[PDB]
């Protein structure tokens, strides 16, 4: 269809894993909706992935307004040892009627999105080839999380060496911080305290 057709079919998808195939990509979030239970119909909900390799991101384009909304609960997943990024357009407007947000959570899905609060944390200090499902298994020994992001370089999909997160029990926050900081871990020692403590401005 149309690009204003589009703003509410389809998804951006950023962090994908290097040399994946639209083909792949399609498949994969194809089998997640099938699988999860998230479709409208028979069919596949996925009907084109558009790759842009150089930036690192894609839009998955959607046969209906309410699988992409569905679609948006699977920000996180795990894919090829990426934490999948998945937005919407910066374009998109809310359709009348029609809900803005997931009415579905995914089990085991890990958000990526954290947002500045108390508890809050920031890992620095970690060998910057590890991905993000390293990084997660290694967090996720204290308790399960609400919210992670592992920080990338837009150039090269190598980590920074620093990442976010969020536990879904506030208490685990502490536990975390006392096993973890000054792990040593390759030729680096891990820094881990609140994300408020040192953040710039």
């Given at each position: 269809?149309?690009?204003?057709?589009?703003?509410?079919?389809?998804?951006?998808?950023?962090?994908?894993?290097?040399?994946?195939?639209?083909?792949?990509?399609?498949?994969?979030?194809?089998?997640?909706?099938?699988?999860?239970?998230?479709?409208?119909?028979?069919?596949?909900?996925?009907?084109?992935?558009?790759?842009?390799?150089?930036?690192?991101?894609?839009?998955?384009?959607?046969?209906?307004?309410?699988?992409?909304?569905?679609?948006?609960?699977?920000?996180?997943?795990?894919?090829?040892?990426?934490?999948?990024?998945?937005?919407?357009?910066?374009?998109?407007?809310?359709?009348?009627?029609?809900?803005?947000?997931?009415?579905?959570?995914?089990?085991?899905?890990?958000?990526?999105?954290?947002?500045?609060?108390?508890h809050?944390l920031?890992?620095?200090?970690?060998?910057?080839?590890?991905?993000?499902?390293?990084?997660?298994?290694?967090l996720?020994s204290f308790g399960?999380?609400?919210?992670?992001?592992?920080?990338?370089?837009?150039?090269?999909?190598?980590?920074?060496?620093?990442?976010?997160?969020?536990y879904?029990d506030i208490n685990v926050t502490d536990q975390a911080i006392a096993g973890l900081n000054?792990?040593?871990?390759?030729?680096?020692?891990?820094?881990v305290?609140?994300?408020?403590?040192?953040?710039?401005?």
């Open positions: 269809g149309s690009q204003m057709t589009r703003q509410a079919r389809h998804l951006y998808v950023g962090n994908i894993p290097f040399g994946i195939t639209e083909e792949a990509m399609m498949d994969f979030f194809n089998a997640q909706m099938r699988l999860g239970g998230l479709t409208q119909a028979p069919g596949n909900p996925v009907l084109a992935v558009q790759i842009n390799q150089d930036k690192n991101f894609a839009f998955l384009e959607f046969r209906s307004v309410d699988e992409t909304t569905q679609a948006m609960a699977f920000d996180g997943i795990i894919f090829q040892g990426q934490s999948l990024k998945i937005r919407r357009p910066h374009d998109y407007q809310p359709l009348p009627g029609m809900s803005e947000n997931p009415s579905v959570y995914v089990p085991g899905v890990v958000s990526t999105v954290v947002p500045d609060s108390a809050k920031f890992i620095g200090g970690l060998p910057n080839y590890l991905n993000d499902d390293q990084v997660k298994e290694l996720t399960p999380l609400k919210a992670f992001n592992l920080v990338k370089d837009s150039a090269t999909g190598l980590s920074k060496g620093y990442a976010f997160c969020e879904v000054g792990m040593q871990l390759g030729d680096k020692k891990l820094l305290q609140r994300a408020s403590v040192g953040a710039k401005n």
